[PDB]
Design a protein around this nucleic acid. Structure first.
Ligand SMILES: [Mg+2]
Ligand SMILES: [Mg+2]
Ligand SMILES: [Mg+2]
Ligand SMILES: [Mg+2]
Ligand SMILES: [Mg+2]
Ligand SMILES: [Mg+2]
Ligand SMILES: [Mg+2]
Ligand SMILES: [Mg+2]
Ligand SMILES: [Mg+2]
Ligand SMILES: [Mg+2]
Ligand SMILES: [Mg+2]
Ligand SMILES: [Mg+2]
Ligand SMILES: [Mg+2]
Ligand SMILES: [Mg+2]
Ligand SMILES: [Mg+2]
Ligand SMILES: [Mg+2]
Ligand SMILES: [Mg+2]
Ligand SMILES: [Mg+2]
Ligand SMILES: [Mg+2]
Ligand SMILES: [Mg+2]
Ligand SMILES: [Mg+2]
Ligand SMILES: [Mg+2]
Ligand SMILES: [Mg+2]
Ligand SMILES: [Mg+2]
Ligand SMILES: [Mg+2]
Ligand SMILES: [Mg+2]
Ligand SMILES: [Mg+2]
Ligand SMILES: [Mg+2]
Ligand SMILES: [Mg+2]
Ligand SMILES: [Mg+2]
Ligand SMILES: [Mg+2]
Ligand SMILES: [Mg+2]
Ligand SMILES: [Mg+2]
Ligand SMILES: [Mg+2]
Ligand SMILES: [Mg+2]
Ligand SMILES: [Mg+2]
Ligand SMILES: [Mg+2]
Ligand SMILES: [Mg+2]
Lengths: 187, 147, 124, 52, 105, 52
RNA sequence: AAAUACCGGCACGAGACCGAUAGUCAACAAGUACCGUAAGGGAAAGUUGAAAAGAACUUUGAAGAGAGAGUUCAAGAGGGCGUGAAACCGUUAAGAGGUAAACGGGUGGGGUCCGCGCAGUCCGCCCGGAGGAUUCAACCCGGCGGCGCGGUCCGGCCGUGCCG
RNA sequence: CCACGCGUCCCCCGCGAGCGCACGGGGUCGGCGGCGAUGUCGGCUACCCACCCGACCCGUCUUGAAACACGGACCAAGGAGUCUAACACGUGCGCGAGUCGGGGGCUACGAAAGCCGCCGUGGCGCAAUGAAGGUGAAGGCCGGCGGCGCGCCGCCGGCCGAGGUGGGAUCCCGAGGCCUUCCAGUCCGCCGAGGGCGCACCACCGGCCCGUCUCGCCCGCCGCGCCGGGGAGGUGGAGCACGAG
RNA sequence: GAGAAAGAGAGUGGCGCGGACGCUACGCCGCGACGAGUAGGAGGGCCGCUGCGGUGAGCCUUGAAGCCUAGGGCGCGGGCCC
RNA sequence: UGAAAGCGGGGCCUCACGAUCCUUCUGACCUUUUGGGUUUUAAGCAGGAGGUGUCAGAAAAGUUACCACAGGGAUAACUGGC
């Protein structure tokens, strides 16, 4: 036989979304075509990001896209999120934006259309620029979820600043023997 | 549903997904959270530190209504009041400043976290942070107490 | 639209029929009668169909018009062709090609018309 | 449209409701793909089958 | 026997809880019972207000809620003697009274 | 689509009357059989009596 | 008083429940038969047929039981009787047999039935030969349909577009 | 000999046509022969039997079972990871700094369904830290008024304003050119030397909040006090550092 | 399919009415290398049972479920159709 | 301490020792003691100590031939094996 180990013989990555949504699958039917028949890797990245899960396309907020479009050089470009452009209320002045997203929430698109921008979805994005030229692709904060506070090096282990799982934050609830220098030992 | 679970593909398999050497016995480690001091010491120190022992004073008849003081920040300060107050106050020529009664919106204490826009206010709270007060003064405006 | 209707119809339609490792579709305007996006005769703006006449001679050819898409009664136009086998097929060929009326399935319409005609000439 | 609202008018017979936004608008895939914007910015097809 | 990482939990099921379980399958039947009794009462006291008597402006006790004004128990006796309504005639003409309420304000 | 057609009202004799109302936008809300199947599955469980 | 609780009782309605080894212990002469001194323990057990039309009469036998006859659509439904499996058994037919039987791979022989096999497929185009039609192309009239190729024909409608 | 022309400048000495054979991107025959209606033809498989090779009885505990290990005469039916609650993570869906009516109310299937919004009470989230009193998440520059052997700056008016470094999918600019006779010469693309602004994320350095320690000099007035506020420098936190529930 | 970053690209001057298949895109097609498995994990079942909402203008006294079979078969197989 | 460089926060190095709860002592013009104030008292915060030698830390004498139960050939009293 061969001296081949078969542990990593299969890639784990997706071939399709695990959604039975039909609009996302029509977007996939369009971007499969643009990915295999253009030579632009923007189409490959947006194909990968249509494939992903709700938790791996986190909601990008309007304040982040304000900042990452106000960076110099990228004036009158097209910002493109594959997640959800949510409204951010701790921002006042909204410039003219050119946003492409799967879904924009109601008062976020109200804010953008009041500022005088334009929200175009992915089908008319592929009509507007097939290779994706003139586009700032963007992503929400993927470590923004609260469940990453618990991950990594375990609590009760030195120099590990990890939020533990407690039913109620208080005085009585896991403050005593591992946390103190008087009561026992401190990590 | 039961149709999609794992007992529908563990039929024909003798141990039903629990093993031949270690049988699926009833309670091999004790019931519940037992043996924390003794034989689950490593789990309760590697994953729930601080768990055993007493710490802090005891307060017998506690009342959350007495300890009630919910906070708001300055970046959310203008979201309490509608947009036309803010645009009429930026448009206003006489320097009259709008009055944000934060207790009417439902927050007793104002803390200062965010950037506050260059626009005079009268913030009418029950408690203030030092930095919240000085950001209101630095933008120009007043800090009014209510009881 | 068309692809939107197809992503609903493709596994849920009551004309669909699944047995014996095969699949079909019993809808009235389906040339080759098989479940496909190409040959489905309900989800398109323009569509031909080839059926036998109510009389036992000839072929009724069914066209879907342009305007009345949401009006199912005055949507299909039916032309009954009762002549020889060569001119029936040339009529269907001209009708589909020179109108440029959905040329994906002129040849499927010709196959189905010839199948109806051989079934309609008397049995040996 | 009094019950479920228009796309620009909200629900006049609910409290706070509006019709849910589309995820893609131009739904017809073939009219998108046989358009001169997209048919221009493609490579050539490679359809010569190269068997073993 | 806890696993790798998670909460430690104390579920209060150590008693015999299945013998004492209240299940709510008569929730819509009881809603229809309250509704039919309410309609029969409302047509029984036939021109009178369906909600019963009038109940005063009252603001809530504690620090969490004293900014809010709600409905109270009944109109106090000092309120009634200032308004000139006799304390026994108020319950006849449809005014809720309680004698327990003070007035510090 | 973004347009709205003009749907005609039919008399009781079958033929079309002169009244002609625009199509409400509910009929151009998005089609999602995923959401329809999910809501139908979870709401058909509500008219259901227990057994033991 | 009211809102509130209700696996007992009287009367009800309903079921993504169970379908006679299930569902109550109990679909039936069931808390019955039966066991225990007693406290108590406690079953099994549904179905002829549409209608008994439940087999008159003859004959052998003492009789159980048969053979004829007859009812029935059917006794291949005959008073514990719808359907009637398996283990096990009787008999018939076939085949075989001294390493207990059985099994996997490979063929061989004998059967049982099937192929309605037993002169073996058609299908287009063309050539030649014998036919038979009211018959082809092209024109005229009518209807229906498809489409800046009418750049820019006239008139309506909509905008998840704008300006007055 | 896989060498074939003509014409010129220099030095040493871009379309010729046809037919055809084929050790050429996987087999064809434009070759044939027999037997077929009461005994023959095909049927691997499934019925019985024969022969050669192979062949210990399953389940299980076990380092190891055919075991002189236990369970098993045979057959039919029943027969064992279920339901509720809590948690955690992953995935699908709606809305999204919000979200949810579950409790209540209003109007055959229907005990369903719809609706409430001055029924969001409330839950969870949007803020943490401290035992607690409690406090509660950028800064810099300019002008003015050794304070001296507050160039720092205390306080007032203006301006800039919400980190940095390295790596980073994507994109942005474009030194040159992508031939059909030859030269200029435009447009639409396309490729690309090199150079940019860099998403998420990772690592590091900074910074802010809460506790605690150390060292200090100031600042406020209705109560000048066993008062209140501030700074610099380490350190403990399940924090912030333009949401993510 | 072609050893060699990138256009079978546009403009300005010197008779016979014809053309197989395809594409359930969750579909179809082409290349290569690969295949052991207890405890266990996972995926796919057009494997199977019972009931419910849809649906087949489904089947059925001109014979449904059930059962029997030296009959014909399909699937690697669970099983299934005559 | 040494004139000074330096050296020293126990023993030249390799061992000589102890969590939670409880008690006791020490520390601050400290926090709370619950409607407010004062004063004792108590609770907290931080640092030692009282001790678990089965030394990651139960509070614990036998006998059964009257014996029982769940198991183990993981393990004895026989043969057999090396
Ligand atoms: Mg191999
Ligand atoms: Mg392997
Ligand atoms: Mg793997
Ligand atoms: Mg297994
Ligand atoms: Mg398992
Ligand atoms: Mg076992
Ligand atoms: Mg185990
Ligand atoms: Mg073990
Ligand atoms: Mg367990
Ligand atoms: Mg121990
Ligand atoms: Mg485990
Ligand atoms: Mg009331
Ligand atoms: Mg009912
Ligand atoms: Mg029975
Ligand atoms: Mg039965
Ligand atoms: Mg029974
Ligand atoms: Mg029985
Ligand atoms: Mg019976
Ligand atoms: Mg019968
Ligand atoms: Mg019968
Ligand atoms: Mg019988
Ligand atoms: Mg042998
Ligand atoms: Mg065993
Ligand atoms: Mg052993
Ligand atoms: Mg083992
Ligand atoms: Mg032995
Ligand atoms: Mg033995
Ligand atoms: Mg045993
Ligand atoms: Mg035995
Ligand atoms: Mg998740
Ligand atoms: Mg394998
Ligand atoms: Mg020192
Ligand atoms: Mg010494
Ligand atoms: Mg303890
Ligand atoms: Mg003795
Ligand atoms: Mg003796
Ligand atoms: Mg042994
Ligand atoms: Mg011996």
């Amino acid at each position: 036989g061969v001296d081949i180990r078969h542990n990593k013989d299969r890639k784990v990555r997706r071939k399709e979304p695990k959604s039975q949504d039909i609009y996302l699958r029509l977007l996939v039917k369009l971007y499969r075509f643009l990915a295999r028949r253009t030579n632009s890797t923007f189409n490959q990245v947006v194909l990968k990001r249509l494939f992903m899960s709700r938790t791996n396309r986190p909601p990008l907020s309007l304040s982040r896209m304000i900042r990452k479009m106000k960076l110099p050089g990228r004036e009158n470009k097209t910002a493109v999120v594959v997640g959800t452009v949510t409204d951010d209320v701790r921002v006042q002045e909204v410039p003219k934006l050119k946003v492409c997203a799967l879904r924009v929430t109601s008062r976020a698109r109200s804010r953008i259309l009041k500022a005088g921008g334009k929200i175009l979805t992915f089908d008319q994005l592929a009509l507007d620029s097939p290779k994706g030229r003139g586009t700032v692709l963007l992503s929400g904060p993927r470590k923004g979820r609260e469940v990453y506070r618990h991950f990594g090096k375990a609590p009760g282990t030195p120099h590990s600043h990890t939020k533990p799982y407690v039913r109620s934050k208080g005085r009585k609830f896991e403050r005593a023997r591992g946390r103190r220098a008087s009561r026992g030992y401190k990590n | 549903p039961s149709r999609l679970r794992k007992t529908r593909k563990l039929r024909g398999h003798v141990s039903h997904g629990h093993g031949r050497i270690g049988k699926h016995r009833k309670h091999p480690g004790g019931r519940g959270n037992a043996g924390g001091m003794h034989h689950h010491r490593i789990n309760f120190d590697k994953y729930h530190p601080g768990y055993f022992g007493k710490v802090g004073m005891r307060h017998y008849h506690l009342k959350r209504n007495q300890s009630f003081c919910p906070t708001v920040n300055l970046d959310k300060l203008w979201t309490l009041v509608s947009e036309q107050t803010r645009v009429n106050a930026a448009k206003n020529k006489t320097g009259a400043a709008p009055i944000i009664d934060v207790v009417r919106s439902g927050y007793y204490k104002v803390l200062g976290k965010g950037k506050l826009p260059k626009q005079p206010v009268i913030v009418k709270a029950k408690f203030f942070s030092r930095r919240a007060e000085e950001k209101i003064k630095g933008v120009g405006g007043a800090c009014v107490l209510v009881a | 639209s068309a692809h939107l209707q197809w992503m609903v119809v493709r596994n849920c339609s009551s004309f669909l029929i699944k047995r014996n490792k095969q699949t079909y579709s019993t809808e009235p305007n389906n040339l080759k009668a098989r479940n496909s996006f190409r040959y489905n005769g309900l989800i398109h703006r323009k569509t031909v169909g080839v059926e036998p006449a109510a009389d036992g001679k000839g072929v009724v050819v069914v066209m879907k018009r342009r305007s009345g898409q949401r009006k199912p009664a005055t949507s299909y136009v039916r032309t009954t062709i009762n002549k020889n086998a060569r001119a029936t097929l040339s009529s269907i060929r001209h009708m589909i090609r020179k109108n440029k009326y959905h040329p994906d399935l002129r040849m499927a319409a010709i196959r189905r018309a010839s199948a109806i005609l051989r079934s309609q000439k008397p049995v040996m | 449209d009094d019950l479920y609202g228009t796309w620009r008018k909200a629900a006049s017979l609910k409290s706070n409701y509006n019709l849910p936004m589309h995820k893609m608008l131009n739904t017809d895939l073939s009219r998108i793909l046989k358009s001169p914007e997209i048919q221009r910015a493609l490579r050539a097809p490679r359809k010569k089958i190269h068997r073993r | 026997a806890p696993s790798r990482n998670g909460m430690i939990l104390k579920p209060h099921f150590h008693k015999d809880w299945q013998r004492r379980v209240a299940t709510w399958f008569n929730q819509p039947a009881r809603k229809i019972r309250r509704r039919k009794a309410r309609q029969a009462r409302a047509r029984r006291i036939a021109p009178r207000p369906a909600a019963g008597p009038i109940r005063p402006i009252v603001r809530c006790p504690t620090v969490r809620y004293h900014t809010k004004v709600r409905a109270g128990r009944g109109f106090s006796l000092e309120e009634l003697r200032v308004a000139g309504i006799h304390k026994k005639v108020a319950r006849t003409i449809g005014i809720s009274v309680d004698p327990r309420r003070r007035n510090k304000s | 689509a973004c347009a709205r057609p003009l749907i005609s009202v039919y008399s009781e004799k079958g033929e079309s009357s002169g009244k002609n109302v625009t199509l409400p936008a509910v009929f151009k809300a998005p089609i999602r059989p995923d959401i329809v199947n999910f809501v139908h599955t979870n709401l058909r469980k509500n008219n259901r009596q227990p057994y033991a």
